[PDB]
Amino acid sequence: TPVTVIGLGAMGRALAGALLDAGYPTTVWNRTAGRGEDLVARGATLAASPAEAVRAGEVVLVCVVDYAASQAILEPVAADLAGRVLVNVTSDSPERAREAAKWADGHGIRYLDGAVMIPTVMVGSTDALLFYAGDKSAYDEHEQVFTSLGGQSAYVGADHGLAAVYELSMIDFFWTSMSGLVHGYALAAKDGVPATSIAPFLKAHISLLSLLIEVTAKDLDAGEYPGAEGNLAMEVEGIEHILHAAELRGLDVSVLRSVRDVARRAVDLGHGADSWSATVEGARNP
Amino acid sequence: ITPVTVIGLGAMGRALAGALLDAGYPTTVWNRTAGRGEDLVARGATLAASPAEAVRAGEVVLVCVVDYAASQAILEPVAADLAGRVLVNVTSDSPERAREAAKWADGHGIRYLDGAVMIPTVMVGSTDALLFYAGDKSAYDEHEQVFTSLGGQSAYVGADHGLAAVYELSMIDFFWTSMSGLVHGYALAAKDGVPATSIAPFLKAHISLLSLLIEVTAKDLDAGEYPGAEGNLAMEVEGIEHILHAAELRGLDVSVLRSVRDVARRAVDLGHGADSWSATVEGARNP
Numbered sequence: 001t002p003v004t005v006i007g008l009g010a011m012g013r014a015l016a017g018a019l020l021d022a023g024y025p026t027t028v029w030n031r032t033a034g035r036g037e038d039l040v041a042r043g044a045t046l047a048a049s050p051a052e053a054v055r056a057g058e059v060v061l062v063c064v065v066d067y068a069a070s071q072a073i074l075e076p077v078a079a080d081l082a083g084r085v086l087v088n089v090t091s092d093s094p095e096r097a098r099e100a101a102k103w104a105d106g107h108g109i110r111y112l113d114g115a116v117m118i119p120t121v122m123v124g125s126t127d128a129l130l131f132y133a134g135d136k137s138a139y140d141e142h143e144q145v146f147t148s149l150g151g152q153s154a155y156v157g158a159d160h161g162l163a164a165v166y167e168l169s170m171i172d173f174f175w176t177s178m179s180g181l182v183h184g185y186a187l188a189a190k191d192g193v194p195a196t197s198i199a200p201f202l203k204a205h206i207s208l209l210s211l212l213i214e215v216t217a218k219d220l221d222a223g224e225y226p227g228a229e230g231n232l233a234m235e236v237e238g239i240e241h242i243l244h245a246a247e248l249r250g251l252d253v254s255v256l257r258s259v260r261d262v263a264r265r266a267v268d269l270g271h272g273a274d275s276w277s278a279t280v281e282g283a284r285n286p
Numbered sequence: 287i288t289p290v291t292v293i294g295l296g297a298m299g300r301a302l303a304g305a306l307l308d309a310g311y312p313t314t315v316w317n318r319t320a321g322r323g324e325d326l327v328a329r330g331a332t333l334a335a336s337p338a339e340a341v342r343a344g345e346v347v348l349v350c351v352v353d354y355a356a357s358q359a360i361l362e363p364v365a366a367d368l369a370g371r372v373l374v375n376v377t378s379d380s381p382e383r384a385r386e387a388a389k390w391a392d393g394h395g396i397r398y399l400d401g402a403v404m405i406p407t408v409m410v411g412s413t414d415a416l417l418f419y420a421g422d423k424s425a426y427d428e429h430e431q432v433f434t435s436l437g438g439q440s441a442y443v444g445a446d447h448g449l450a451a452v453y454e455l456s457m458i459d460f461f462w463t464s465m466s467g468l469v470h471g472y473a474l475a476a477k478d479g480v481p482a483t484s485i486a487p488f489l490k491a492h493i494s495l496l497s498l499l500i501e502v503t504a505k506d507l508d509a510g511e512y513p514g515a516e517g518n519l520a521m522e523v524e525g526i527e528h529i530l531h532a533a534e535l536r537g538l539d540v541s542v543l544r545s546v547r548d549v550a551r552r553a554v555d556l557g558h559g560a561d562s563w564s565a566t567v568e569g570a571r572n573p
Contacts, residue, residue, distance in 0.1 A: 010517075065521075091525060093532050094478060117491060119517055129491040152491065162480070168529045169475035169485050172543070174492045175526050176467020177460070178563055179546040181500065184459035185507050186570045191381065191452045195504035197443075198456050202500050204404060204416040204439065205461050206493060213468065213489045217482035220472045229406065230297070235462075238378075242459050245380060245451075252552075252573035254545035256459070259466040262539055276465055283473045286539040 001145060002027065004057025006050060006073065008035035010120045011089060012063035015149060016044055018124030022148035029053035031069075051077045059085045059142050067096060071103075078107040085138045089114040089130075094161025094168075101134060101160035110138040113160045115167035118150070126151035133163035177209075179255050183246070190249040212276075219277035226275055233272035236263045262286075287311060288432060291344025293337055293360060294377070295322040297407045299350035302376060302436055303331055305411025309435035316340035341367045346374065346429055348401075354379040354387060361390075369395040372425045376401040376417075381448025381455075388421060388447040397425040400447045402454035405437065413438030420450035466542055470533070477536040503564050512558060512565035519566065520559035523550045549573075 001024060005016040008030035016039050019026045028036045029047045040046050047053035054060055054077050064070040070090065074081065086109050088100055097113040104111035112134040122128045128150030132139055139146065139155045146153045156162045181202075185195040219225050225232075243256045266274075266282030288311060292303040295317035303326050306313045313331040315323050316339075327333050334340035341347050341364050349357045357375050361368065373396045375387060384400040391398035404416040415437030419426055426433065426442045433440045443449045471489075472482035506512050530543045552569030553561075 091528060093528065117488075118495065121516065127491070127494075129488060131488075154488070161478070164532075165475055165478045165480055166485060166488060168532050169471040169480070170488060170492055171525065172471035172474050172529050172533070173464070173467045173489060174496070175522070175529070175546055176470065176542060177464035177496055178499065178503075179467075179549065179566070180460040180463025181496075181503055182507070182564065182567050183463065183570055184456040185504060186567050187459055188452055188456035189507065191448070193449070193452055193456070195507045198453060199500050199504040201404070201416060201418075201439075201441070201453065202457060202460060203497065204414070205457055206497050206500070207414075208405065208461070209464055209468070210490065210493050212465065213486050213493070214483075216465075216468055217472060217486040220469070220476065220482040229408075238458070239462050241378070241380065242455055242462065245455050246459070250571070252549055252570050254548060254573070255463060255542060258541035258545045259463060261541055262466065265539075277469065279466070279469050280473050283470055283539045284537075286541075 001025075001059065001142065002057050003145060004029070004047075004053045004060045006053055006060060006062045007064035007070075007090075008032075008039070009063060009065060011065075011116060011123075012061070013039060014120040014123035015061050015063060015089065015116075017042070018149050019145070020044060021124055022145075024145065024148065027053050027056035050074075051080050054080045054084065057084065059087060059145055061087050061089060063089050065090050067092070075103075078103075078109065082108045085110045085112065085135070085142060087112045087114055087132075089116055091115055091167060092164055094164040097133070097161045097164050098159075110135040111160065112138055113163045115163045116150075117167060117170060123149060128152055129154065131156050131163040131166045133157050134160045176255075183251065183255065186251055187242075187246050187249065190251070216277050219275065220280055225271065225278035225280075227273045229275065231273045232263060232276060232278055233267050235276055236260060236267060239263065288345050288429060289314070289343055290346045290348065290432060291315070291334075291340045292348045292350060293340055294350035294356075295319075295326075296350060296352065298376065298403060298410070299348075300326060301407040301410035302348055302350055302403075304329070305436050306432070307331060308411050309431075311432065311435065314340050314343035338364045338367050341371065344371070346372045346432055349373065349375045349377060351377045353377060354383045358387070358390065365390075365394045365396070372397045372399065372422075372429060374399040374401050374419070374425075376403055378402065378454075379451055381446075381451040384420070384448040384451050385446070397422040398447065399425050400450045402450045403437075404454060404457060410436060415439060416441070418443050418450040418453045420444055421447040470538070470542060473538055474529070474533050474536070477533075477538065499563075506562060506564035507567055512561035512563075512567075514558075514561040514565070516562060518560045519550060519554055519563060522563055523547060523554060526550065 129152040262282035271278035549569040558565035
């Protein structure tokens with residue numbers, strides 16, 4: 001199967017590299033020249049025009065981050081895209097993904113919206129996780145192409161905005177947790193403790209989080225948050241002691257204060273006696 | 287065998303006593319309110335009439351009250367019986383409070399260890415339970431087996447008694463912030479009709495990534511260098527703005543995300559756009 005990658009920014013180069021590693025004939029195209037010289041030596045073919053690149057591929061991966069740049073490239077070649085499988089990976093909104101789906105269907109293009117959930121350095125590895133939503137027969141026909149991009153690839157449904165839904169929900173958790181990791185290290189460093197001294201111990205809380213990922217999901221789906229294991233009214237207090245310790249040390253505490261605000265909102269909504277899962281009510285009713 | 291005493295029979299106190307009984311230590315317990323601890327007496331603990339009898343029955347005295355002031359209230363009248371013993375306060379406290387408690391114990395001849403329990407009560411006593419201790423070094427080493435019984439990953443972190451709270455506060459800062467984002471990610475998905483149990487198995491990929499970045503972030507922060515050719519703050523910030531906008535469009539509270547983004551933007555305005563996420567530490571230090 002011939003594959004074409006459009007856009008050779010960091011993501012596009014990684015995706016093309018993963019396809020070449022898997023042994024697929026790979027054609028690349030970038031607006032700015034010299035992004036693909038390393039790929040071309042590896043075995044990739046550089047294309048003059050986007051219309052040429054699209055015609056070289058049964059599956060077309062489009063990796064241009066700007067929507068306007070992406071649409072200005074794809075629309076004029078919609079006639080050449082017809083009958084091929086188009087896959088958009090540039091992270092976006094579910095609504096933007098749905099609009100591409102409508103444009104693509106009105107032109108007879110089978111369309112998959114994708115989300116890369118791991119850093120570019122892990123693209124192509126057997127535990128890389130990528131999400132795909134859209135044409136089911138397109139995914140099944142070229143499933144091993146997508147398995148080549150990441151062995152943990154998962155199709156999440158026919159609605160094209162679902163890949164973005166899974167993606168943004170996951171990176172909502174990820175960037176928020178990376179915010180607290182840096183903040184926790186910063187806190188310790190105000191008292192002279194190196195981050196490398198805490199780091200081995202944080203693995204206890206990673207195993208804890210893994211457990212609560214499941215408990216929290218159950219609770220959120222049931223709509224019931226049992227108070228046992230301590231109450232939200234006292235968890236708000238515990239978080240206020242972190243806030244206290246960090247502001248006395250001169251750190252920006254805007255995140256912790258926001259975390260406390262949503263919990264206090266939930267307490268004020270009658271969840272003072274409930275578990276941490278009940279903070280979802282604070283998030284839904286500001 | 288070393289006789290041990292637990293004062294304070296809240297949830298934490300009862301778990302600490304139960305772990306001592308599991309390991310076979312003679313355990314004497316005390317609570318202010320009658321009715322907590324009959325389960326522990328059924329398993330072999332001895333209930334003491336007053337705190338002074340409890341402290342006199344133990345070489346090691348574990349105090350597990352809700353607050354430091356409460357420990358002082360129970361400890362001050364019995365400070366004469368503690369002289370020459372080992373006192374551990376597992377009650378949560380600030381590092382500054384822990385250093386004051388250290389002074390109080392010096393004036394009475396008490397070896398003092400400040401403790402912090404880092405896992406839920408249900409795992410107290412387990413081989414991978416983690417507890418921190420800071421303070422008199424001979425107290426920890428002489429009774430290390432007692433402390434390992436409460437949690438097999440127990441760790442003494444130094445002579446400054448406030449260090450146990452320092453380690454603990456850095457960790458639960460990461461913990462509660464992550465739990466806040468976990469709830470938020472599920473709510474975001476629930477807005478498009480996706481159940482949280484459908485997201486949950488995929489969140490395991492990001493747990494291992496977090497596991498990896500724990501090490502990477504610690505180095506960068508310790509060295510003062512944030513190499514960003516592995517993914518730069520400027521387009522990490524824009525990715526966060528996509529979460530923010532999508533969540534706001536759906537009527538969710540976005541105060542956490544806006545604060546996450548702003549701390550990051552601040553680091554970008556300080557010239558770290560091409561550096562890694564670790565460089566956000568500069569926005570956290572300079573609001």
